Homo-oligomer: A and B are copies of this chain.
Amino acid sequence: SLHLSKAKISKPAPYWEGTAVIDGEFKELKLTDYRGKYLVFFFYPLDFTFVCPTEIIAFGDRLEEFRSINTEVVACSVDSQFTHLAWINTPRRQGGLGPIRIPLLSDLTHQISKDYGVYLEDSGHTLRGLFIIDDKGILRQITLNDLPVGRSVDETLRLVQAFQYTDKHGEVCPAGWKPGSETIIPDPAGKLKYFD
């Protein structure tokens, strides 16, 4: 036994489609609906659990920071749309989500999880996997966390900003780059402007 997935960095993100809960309603959603925008596509283990609601809420409460840089966010677990909706209709105080502006996509058949290489065969759900997909549908970044440890909205934002910067300019982003940081001309002569 060894690890298989369709997700490859610099190649089109694996196509997905299914039912999502969007503003309390069931809707058809597909990867290609986001063509033209960056997409932060992330999986979480299970509705009605622990680290999961904090990550959905963390992104959800900061959604405008993504939308103002032309970036959408979609969360996905193996739960049904009916469980997603019941979880949204559970108050935050009870480990619920409350109203949420991020689509919750359902992957009940597990095909989307397997395609993205985040499915845990022994558990029947996913680990914490996040995928940054560009406006052309190309996969740029993959972040996979073991179960006990949540993700960072700050780090996700920095990555989206850096990919959009390098999309638009001839230069590349050094370690720890934030908007306004110095960049490098990827040329053996050009690079010296940065290194001096």
Contacts and interface: CB of A to CB of B under 8 A. Distances in A.
Interface in A1-55: 2-10, 46-51, 53-55
A172 B150 CA distance: 8
Interface in A31-86: 46-51, 53-55, 57-59, 78-80, 82-83, 85-86
Nearest to A44: B175
Contacts of A194: 50, 95
A76 to B, nearest CB: 13
A7 to B, nearest CB: 7
Given A3-B4, A6-B2, A175-B58, A78 B108 contact: yes
A: contact size bracket? 35 or more
A82 B49 contact: yes
Given A149-B159, A159-B149, A109 B80 contact: no
Given A6-B2, A173-B150, A195 B49 contact: no
Contacts of A141: 144-146, 149
Contact of A51 (B82, B86, B110, B173): B173
Nearest to A90: B86
Nearest to A176: B152
A140 interface: yes
A94 B163 contact: no
A54 B181 CA distance: 13
Point out which of A90, A117, A144, A196 has the most chain B C-beta atoms below 10 A from its C-beta.
A144
Contacts of A49: 82, 186, 191
For the complex of A and B, the 3 pairs showing the least CB-CB separation, nearest first, are A108-B124, A54-B174, A58-B175
